[PDB]
Amino acid sequence: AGASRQRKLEALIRDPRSPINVESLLDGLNSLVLDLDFPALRKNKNIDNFLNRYEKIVKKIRGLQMKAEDYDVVKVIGRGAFGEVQLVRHKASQKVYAMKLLSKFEMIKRSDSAFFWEERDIMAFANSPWVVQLFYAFQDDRYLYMVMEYMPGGDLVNLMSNYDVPEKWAKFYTAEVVLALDAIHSMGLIHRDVKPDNMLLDKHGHLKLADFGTCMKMDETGMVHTAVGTPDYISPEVLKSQGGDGFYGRECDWWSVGVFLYEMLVGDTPFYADSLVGTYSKIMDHKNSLCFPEDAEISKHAKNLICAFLTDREVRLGRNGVEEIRQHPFFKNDQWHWDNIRETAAPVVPELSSDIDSSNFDDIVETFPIPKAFVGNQLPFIGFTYYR
């Protein structure tokens, strides 16, 4: 039926996961007008007349759609790959959010301009208390923006520097990391950058993972095909794949949990060295180079858990699913079960003096040229806008 073809078509456009939803279609139109509205290109009558037709309505859309001017920048709370995270207050609602900015220019120039799709999608659609929630994604000519729930507790780096961390606490945060990662892994995704910087504490001292900009979608075999920042938390299979064309899967996140628990209990990274090259070399030689210092206050079970994660991938814990991790005797405790850990009293419940208190965080351009012909610099970002 002709009516059924129109039913099907409407169903694609109503779906919030769809590439041709209304927001994506509006990005389509906006991005086209941005890419065309340059006096040189307007020598083409097709382009000139089209812009004259859509001048009014695009100005009208631009005004109504969500934009940077809707938010007051309170403070920059972190810097990263293609931009920054700023603590913001939405002007009209007076509600506080974390807002991550990514430079379009820098992404085009450094050629790393599709990681943001999975970063957006996971935060938008996880519906998991272990994943930072995305409320809005929007864009202007210069930047992509992700408005996310603010995590006033700070990161595990900050926690480790302020508390000598007892094993009982280490057990708690590790357990939350495990469930967090299992939730991500059950969505078919690998984090690939599990480190204390990206483990954030909410207003009640409970963990969520953040920075989903190195997320890859796993294939039907559990594997993924790109770059890396700092090496301390990266698994040895990930290091060999960068030079070669090797594969790796979810086990690379489980390595990092081993590294995390060593950091927490010992106070240092297991493969610490002064240079990056030193660290890289120690990680490749993990069979020899892993060594618990004789002064470290650590249980036999905690050593056994760290040692089970810090092996070659083929014998590593977390290949055969999360259940073998959960049953490890290290995790035996009086305080929580796996089904309820996140609804128990956290070790450190942050004490905050206002809704913009960022005291658990440490204190802290160039554009496209006016092009001679059509280049389509906005085309990679059509579909980014998301209004929940």
Next chain:
Amino acid sequence: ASRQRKLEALIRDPRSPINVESLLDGLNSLVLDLDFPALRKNKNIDNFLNRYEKIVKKIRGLQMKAEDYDVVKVIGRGAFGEVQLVRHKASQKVYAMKLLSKFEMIKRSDSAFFWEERDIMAFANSPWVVQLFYAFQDDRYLYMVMEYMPGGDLVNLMSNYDVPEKWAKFYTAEVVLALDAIHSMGLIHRDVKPDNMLLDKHGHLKLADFGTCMKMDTPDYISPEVLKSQFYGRECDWWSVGVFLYEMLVGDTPFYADSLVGTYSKIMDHKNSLCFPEDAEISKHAKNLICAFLTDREVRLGRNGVEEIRQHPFFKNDQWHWDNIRETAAPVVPELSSDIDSSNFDDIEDETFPIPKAFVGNQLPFIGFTYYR
């Protein structure tokens, strides 16, 4: 939230340039204008096309297209295209479908005439205007799917009947109301002639070919003010009604001539050159009405609205009033053998854009054309 309410309201509106169909045209037209092997040397373009290849192909398959309609016969030809009698395959319903060449319009068309043509037929909601059911497009052509008018045109009627005054009264009155409806929408036809007056299944009139409409703020039927301008208003349509009525009652055009230059010269000399031949038996009122339309623009009947036209004694009759004319028995009731009978229409006899090196945007002037009822 109020800003999101307002924005959604613009998108729901079928008159809006950013309705869903227009937004889909936006996406389709962008993909057509970009998807060329040369342009895909740009990674921005290549990657964008890779993201939207599948879903656009899927949309194209779902959306209405030429292959949905079976072409029965070409029933007319014109400026940048043609009108074909078609049957929609799935519904089995018969329609008149106008095609317009995108290439030829880009090449030779100085104005985007199709917008007003589409809008009038889409949104008039008048029994005097041909209704548009669907408008759609492919890479080569715009398509307007309209109600089929099986009764033929008034040219066809005049060639097959001696038209008595009682009939002329009826058709002229229907032309009047038709034009009044157009004029009430803020539009001038600029091409009122019997070729563009069509008869429905019941022998009642509607106007057609709204491709020369301008929004207000062949030479036989052209008014003298239109000739000298190469500004003007609605009275140029009313001239042509005068010409129409003379043609029906006499059997010849009032300013007929051998050349075009002769016709043009006779039209400019309408004060002298208008002359009722002594063997044609015309009434005093019919002469009075023809003479009232065929004047200089400033004193022409229809300047001060439709009302002076309606009260003219010519239109006094026993068969119909102005409020019910379209509900009365037409003079010539079409005798049709089927839903594709085109026997009241004469038979008819019988290039693309180059593959560009860089972006030209040949599909951009047609974003927004799609309309689904």
